[PDB]
């Protein structure tokens, strides 16, 4: 028993949402993700390449409107958000592939 | 004796908004005075009112009500807005009167 | 599993979903009509011209 590594019970993913609303906060945060494959899967390599195409942004990127990331360009052109990031958080048996962004109340919709 | 009180408490239960967890004042039609009154409410009272209402609408879309336990009791119904609303109407009537003179 | 197969083959891609509705309709019509007409005529045996037609159809004068 002492030298056997314990296998953890699997965690069920659920398409769903949780909305914590507080209009008194200056900017809104939104994260959206689908279930990932987990460390061992080779696809994680492709997923990361994918996230690279979309990439990330934040009002201090100098590239501004010329950034190669389409989403980044749009965010700039239309003042869509203060920032956004893609991620591919892995775990043993599962993971989270998604993106998170920070925007002003009135631009959440376009950004999303 | 306690006639008016028997009637009121009766109508109160007959009305039925307490089954949604709403206070009498939560059910007021928001005309001009009521709108001003609401702007004067302290933050906490205002947020509580908001939740009670949001909750009611959700129960309403679900075609459910709260469990009998959670029903607002006649004597525990807090008239949180009546005080403000009366002052707003008092102020308004003053102006109306004064602008006539 | 048909549901999974159906999903993968038909309902996943919007293009195939439309193709399934069209082809689905063409087949549904053909079947549905034949069936309804079938039911209608059974519930009305010997009352329709289709039924009595033979009596005057090349069997008189």
């Amino acid at each position: 028993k002492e030298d056997a590594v314990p296998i953890l019970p699997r965690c069920r993913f659920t398409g769903s949402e949780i909305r914590a609303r507080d209009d008194a906060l200056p900017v809104a945060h939104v994260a959206l993700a689908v279930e990932g494959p987990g460390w061992a899967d080779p696809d994680n390599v492709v997923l990361h390449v994918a996230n690279a195409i979309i990439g990330r942004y934040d009002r201090t990127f100098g590239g501004g409107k010329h950034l190669s990331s389409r989403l980044a360009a749009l965010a700039v052109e239309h003042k869509l958000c203060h920032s956004f990031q893609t991620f591919n958080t892995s775990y043993s048996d599962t993971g989270l592939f998604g993106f998170h962004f920070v925007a002003d109340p009135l631009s959440i919709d376009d950004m999303m | 004796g306690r006639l008016m009180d028997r009637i009121r408490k009766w109508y109160y239960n007959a009305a039925g908004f307490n089954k949604y967890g709403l206070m009498r004042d939560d059910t007021l039609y928001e005309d001009d005075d009521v709108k001003e009154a609401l702007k004067r409410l302290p933050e906490d009272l205002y947020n509580e009112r908001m939740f009670r209402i949001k909750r009611a609408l959700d129960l309403s879309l679900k075609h459910r009500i709260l469990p009998k336990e959670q029903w607002v009791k006649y004597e525990e119904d807090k008239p949180y807005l009546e005080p403000y609303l009366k002052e707003v109407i008092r102020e308004r009537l003053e102006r109306e009167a004064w602008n006539k003179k | 599993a048909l549901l999974r197969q159906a999903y993968s083959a038909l309902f996943r891609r919007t293009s195939t979903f439309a193709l399934t509705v069209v082809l689905g309709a063409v087949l549904f019509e053909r079947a549905f009509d034949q069936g309804a007409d079938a039911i209608f005529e059974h519930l009305n045996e010997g009352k329709l011209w289709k039924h009595i037609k033979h009596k005057y159809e090349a069997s008189e004068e």
């Binding site: - | 906490d44 947020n47 509580e48 959700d58 | 549905f32 009509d33 309804a36 007409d37 209608f40």
Partner: protein
């Protein structure tokens, strides 16, 4: 008075079946979509 009589009734048969079918189907879809709000749960969490 009404030569359409038989056709009219044959049409009623098809109308009912398609009506029965289409209504059930649309009831499910309406329910499927609303399920999100029907089962929705909320809570009031003030910094109290």
């Amino acid at each position: 008075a009404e030569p359409e009589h038989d056709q009219r009734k044959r049409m009623g048969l098809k109308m009912l079946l398609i009506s029965a079918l289409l209504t059930s189907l649309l009831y499910y879809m309406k329910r499927h979509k609303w399920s999100v709000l029907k089962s929705r749960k909320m809570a009031y969490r003030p910094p109290k």
